[PDB]
Each structure stands twice: as C-alpha cells, then as structure tokens.
Design a protein around this ligand. Structure first.
Ligand SMILES: *[C@@H]1O[C@H](CO)[C@@H](O[C@@H]2O[C@H](CO)[C@@H](O[C@@H]3O[C@H](CO)[C@@H](O)[C@H](O)[C@@H]3O)[C@H](O)[C@H]2NC(C)=O)[C@H](O)[C@H]1NC(C)=O
Ligand SMILES: *[C@@H]1O[C@H](CO)[C@@H](O[C@@H]2O[C@H](CO)[C@@H](O)[C@H](O)[C@H]2NC(C)=O)[C@H](O)[C@H]1NC(C)=O
Ligand SMILES: [Cl-]
Ligand SMILES: [Cl-]
Ligand SMILES: [Cl-]
Ligand SMILES: [Cl-]
Ligand SMILES: [Cl-]
Ligand SMILES: [Cu+2]
Ligand SMILES: [Cu+2]
Ligand SMILES: [Cu+2]
Ligand SMILES: [Cu+2]
Length: 534
C-alpha cells in the first residue's frame, strides 16, 4: 500500500556502526578479587536529521544516540551499569538474553523517574550471544524503544573466538539492528501513542538509518540481525540487483541464546520482534555486484498479518568491490558447538493463549496491570517445563519472550498448515514467533536463580496493552544464596535513587570514584550470581 512517510533518498547514506561503550572504571569485587566493570549511561533527548531536506526527528536515547552504544563484555566479567534518567518520562532497563536477578531484569514497574538512576548488576556468565538492552517501562515500552532506547550487548568468549568466524566489530562483524517507523511531512517521527493494534512503520532502518548502503569486499561477513521494531516481523533474503527476485544462500550460525550446533543453510530468514540471528554471508561470488537485503511481502509470506508498504521490501544495499585488500582468514566450521539443551520432560505442558479480552491484548484472559491475576505459574528452580504457547487467532501474530530462561523449540503446528520448526530454531532461543494460528511448545530449564520474572509478546503495542504476565521461579525457605533479597523485583535495596545533574557532570558526590567503589563493593557482598558458579 502507498508509503505514508515522505519519499527518502534510498541507498545513499552509509550504514552507521554504533560506537563501543567503554566502562568509566573497575571495582575490585571483595568476594572473589575480580574486577567489576562500571559504566554510566545517560538517557536524554536529542534530535537527528533523518530526511536530508526536511526538519529533524525528536528522539530519546542511551548516551543521546540511537541505537545506544554497543557493549562488548567478555564472559566471566561482572558489569554494573548506572542508567541515569535525564529525560521526560520514566525508564526500566532490560538486558534481553541475560539471566539477571529479578531486581536487575527490567521488571515493568521497576522504574527510574527523571532525575533518578538505577545501578544494574549483570552476571555475563551465559554462552557467547548477541544480547540487547532496551526500555521495559510499564505501558510506555513501545514509545521508549521506538524513540531510541535500545542498544546492542555482545557477550564474547575464547571458545567462540577460536572458531575463526568473520571478526572485528565494524570490520567483518557488523551489527544489523532493524526497525520500522513512520515520519511526518517535516521529517519528525509519528508517535506510536494511541496505536492499540500494531505500529507497522513504512520506513525500514538499519542501525537507525533509513535504507542505507555499505561498501563490502568480496569475502565473508558476520551479520548480527536484531528485529528492534515495535511491530514489524521480517522475511529476510539477499538478491543481486541484476536478478532481484533470486534468493542467494547464506548460513545462520546463531540464535537468541548463542551458536547453533551446525550452521543452517538458508535462503530466507524469518525474524520477529526481539529475535537475534547471526548470519555469515559470503560476497566472494558477487565481486563487482550490488546485493540488496530485501524483505518478503504478503505479510511475510502468509506467516504474519503485517501491512506492506511501497518500500518495506527493501532493507539496504551492499556494493561489492572487485577484490579483497587482505586475505579472508575466516571460516564457518560445520561443527559450531554442543548446544546445552535442557533435559526432555514428561511434565504435562502448561498452556498460554495469546488473544484479546475486549479491547485489550491478554494472556489466558489476563492483563499485566491486573496484579491479582497476572502471576500465571509457580516453577520450582531447577525444574524443566514445556510451555504450549497458543495463537488461536488468524488476525494477529505474537513473538513470545520468556525472561530468565533459554529454551528449545520442541514443535510448531499451523492452523494454516504453513510451517513447522525452522532449521535456524534447532538451538536455544528466548523469543519464538507464533505466526497466524500457530502453537509452539518450548522446553526450558527454570534455573538457576529464584525470582519473579515476566513473559509476554514482544510486539511492543500488544505488550503495553497488555499482553504480559509473570512467573515465580520458586525455592524452599532453606535454599540460601540471599534469596530473600533477590526474589522481589521491587526490593527496596535495588530501587532507583535521585541525583543532581551537577554531581553527575562533575563526577562528584555519589558519582565520586570513592562513592561508586564503596556502593559496588557493598552490592557485591550480597553475592547475587553465586548460584551460577559452574
Ligand atoms: C515467589 O516465590 C518466593 C519463594 O521462592 C516467595 O517468597 C517466599 O515467601 C514465603 C511466604 O511469605 C516466605 O516465608 C515467610 O517467612 C517470613 C519471615 O522469615 C515469615 O514471617 C512467614 O511466616 C513465612 O514463613 C519465604 O521466606 C519467601 N522466600 C524467599 C526466598 O523470599 C514469594 O512470595 C513469591 N512471590 C510471589 C509474588 O508470589
Ligand atoms: C548475603 O548478603 C550479606 C550482606 O551483604 C552478606 O554478608 C556479608 O558477608 C561478608 C562475608 O561473610 C562479611 O565480611 C560482611 O560483613 C557481611 N555483611 C553483612 C552486612 O553481614 C552475606 O555474605 C551474603 N550471603 C550469601 C549466602 O550470599
Ligand atoms: Cl575476519
Ligand atoms: Cl495486530
Ligand atoms: Cl533508531
Ligand atoms: Cl582471501
Ligand atoms: Cl547527586
Ligand atoms: Cu526484549
Ligand atoms: Cu527479555
Ligand atoms: Cu502480540
Ligand atoms: Cu520483557
């Protein structure tokens, strides 16, 4: 259908690369003698000239940019991030892909008001994976994410580095953060406010830039795909501009939770809101060509319900040089890793229906705001459960996310007989797309931390009104590990605190090296992540 946003000069602006976020300082953890990396992020307003010849867009971003800066954290290094709200609305930061404690996980009611900050303590102990950090504030997650509160968080480890995959952040390892937005006639953003169905968007962005291009050499690149859109799901494929409908093969090497056991040879990648897939594309057979990254129409080939617009079949262009300037020393091994799959269970699976209750998107008839009813499962820590995630509807799709866990996709049935489990769903994930009339069974180890966690649809419009619920990963009162201060996401110990911008700017008072060092060493003594040792 006709583009609504003004006409854009397609494939004329280079793909931006978010800068790497550096820690401000390190603090010795008195528990283990190891260095904790401490970071400060200021959430604040900024303008960005998206349309060359119109006005600017009003955004709110981590460190005044969108996407937020990229974190790059070695496995085993604990991080503390001071998220400082200097904006106009509350925030709640979630690190998507991290088994964070309940009070460091971005619980939707666990907000920071403007003129407050919160310190988030992250374990970084899971398998090498592409995480992302983004807003989770109750009822305003769609508008906070849409206006710029999302960024990448790469968890790295030597074992993955030894595979010799294409490497170097911004060299041959490229972030590909997809969004779908809409602009006014003067080049400002159309708000998601008031939208209760889906905000599709008619402008496709990579790393915050409409329809970019990149100069590539004829060799192998690792692309880290993330669907950070409010509502748009994608069917990604690559094509030579000399044969724009001919799909070129590539390899998926990783899903949400890390490496697949083996690369999945693929010509079409379904990716829905909050899914991460890492792809290796070999440009060597296309020296001197232009390869367009494109998006499947027909509402992702009948899987989705998304509206299609004139230019939503276009993502970006890669202009391939005639030659490499340096040898391609990278490879994609046939064997990537032993995926740590959960033990099969015979426990009769729980059922969750993703539908509506009057004008509200619900789970088993319940809206997140409804405290009395929204706690839908008690799961003893250590237990493996199958959850049957049901989309009975033909008129909506729902990428379902479960906090804390990594899960295996056991099965998919389609009431449109459209598809079962995709080859790139063979490993571990934390989001799974319920297409039209789809039921998916996932299996997860509810481990290793007790606490109250969210699960929900990651269509941020659905999530906000109000397709989200909670589970309690439970322990018996003799469990230990300071569980009584780490189960409650709203625990007073970990709540946000007020700051004065002067102190922040001068790095004085509670921002002094001394105050930060004392505050982090005190936090570290509670031993939040001790139960994940081994
Ligand atoms: C989520 O599950 C956790 C358990 O993993 C629940 O917290 C547990 O709640 C029980 C009942 O309040 C606590 O026992 C109580 O202890 C106090 C004082 O020592 C006593 O006054 C009461 O008679 C009772 O025995 C238990 O300590 C607590 N466990 C932990 C580890 O905090 C929690 O309530 C559940 N959350 C929700 C929202 O349902
Ligand atoms: C639970 O948290 C408390 C409070 O941080 C920890 O108590 C500290 O432990 C170290 C070593 O035992 C002492 O030198 C500190 O003086 C303790 N502080 C206080 C205020 O008691 C405790 O270690 C933690 N327990 C577990 C199992 O994690
Ligand atoms: Cl490389
Ligand atoms: Cl919808
Ligand atoms: Cl953006
Ligand atoms: Cl080479
Ligand atoms: Cl202050
Ligand atoms: Cu998320
Ligand atoms: Cu999450
Ligand atoms: Cu949904
Ligand atoms: Cu969430």
């Amino acid at each position: 259908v006709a583009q609504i946003s003004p006409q854009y000069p397609m494939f004329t602006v280079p793909l931006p690369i978010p800068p790497v976020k550096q820690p401000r300082l390190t603090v010795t953890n008195p528990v283990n003698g190891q260095e904790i990396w401490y970071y400060e992020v200021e959430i604040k307003p900024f303008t960005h000239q998206v349309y060359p010849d119109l006005g600017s867009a009003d955004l709110v971003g981590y460190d005044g940019m969108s996407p937020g800066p990229t974190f790059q954290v070695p496995r085993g290094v604990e991080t503390v991030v001071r998220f400082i709200n200097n904006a106009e609305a509350p925030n709640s930061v979630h690190l998507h892909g991290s088994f964070s404690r309940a009070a460091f996980d971005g619980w939707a009611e666990d907000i920071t008001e403007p003129g407050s900050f919160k310190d988030y303590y992250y374990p970084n102990r899971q398998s090498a994976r592409t995480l992302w950090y983004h807003d989770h504030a109750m009822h305003i997650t769609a508008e906070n994410a849409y206006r710029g509160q999302a960024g990448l968080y790469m968890l790295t480890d030597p074992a993955e580095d030894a595979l010799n995959l294409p490497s170097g952040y911004g060299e041959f390892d490229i972030p590909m953060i997809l969004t779908s937005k809409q602009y006014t006639a003067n080049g400002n953003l159309v708000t998601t406010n008031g939208e209760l169905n889906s905000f599709w968007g008619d402008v496709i962005h990579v790393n915050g830039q409409p329809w970019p291009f990149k100069n590539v050499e004829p060799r192998k690149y690792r692309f880290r795909f993330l669907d950070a859109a409010v509502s748009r799901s994608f069917g990604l494929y690559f094509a030579d501009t000399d044969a724009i409908d001919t799909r070129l093969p590539f390899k998926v090497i990783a899903s949400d939770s890390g490496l697949l056991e083996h690369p999945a040879d693929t010509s079409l990648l379904y990716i829905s809101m909050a899914e991460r897939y890492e792809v290796v594309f070999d440009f060597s057979d296309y020296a001197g060509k232009t390869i367009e990254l494109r998006n499947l129409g027909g509402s992702i080939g009948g899987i989705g319900t998304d509206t299609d617009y004139d230019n939503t079949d276009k993502v970006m262009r890669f202009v391939v040089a005639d030659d490499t300037t340096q040898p391609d020393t990278s490879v994609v091994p046939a064997n990537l890793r032993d995926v740590p799959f959960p033990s099969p269970t015979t426990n009769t699976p729980r059922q969750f229906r993703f539908g509506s209750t009057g004008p509200t998107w619900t789970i088993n008839g319940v809206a997140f705001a409804d405290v009395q009813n929204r706690l839908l499962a008690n799961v003893p820590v250590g237990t493996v459960e199958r959850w049957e995630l049901i989309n009975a509807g033909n008129g909506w799709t729902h990428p379902i996310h479960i906090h804390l866990v990594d899960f295996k996709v056991i099965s998919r049935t389609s009431g449109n007989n459209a598809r079962t489990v995709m080859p790139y769903e063979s490993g571990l994930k934390d989001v799974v797309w319920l297409g039209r009339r789809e039921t998916v069974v996932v299996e997860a180890h509810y481990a290793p931390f007790p606490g109250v966690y969210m699960f929900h649809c990651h269509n941020l419009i659905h999530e906000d009104h109000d397709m989200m619920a909670a589970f309690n990963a439970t322990v018996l009162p003799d469990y230990g590990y300071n569980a009584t201060v780490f189960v409650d996401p709203m625990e007073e110990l970990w709540q946000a605190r007020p700051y004065e911008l002067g102190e922040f700017q001068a790095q004085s008072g509670q921002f002094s090296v001394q105050a930060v060092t004392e505050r982090i060493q005190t936090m570290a003594e509670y031993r939040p992540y001790a139960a994940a040792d081994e």
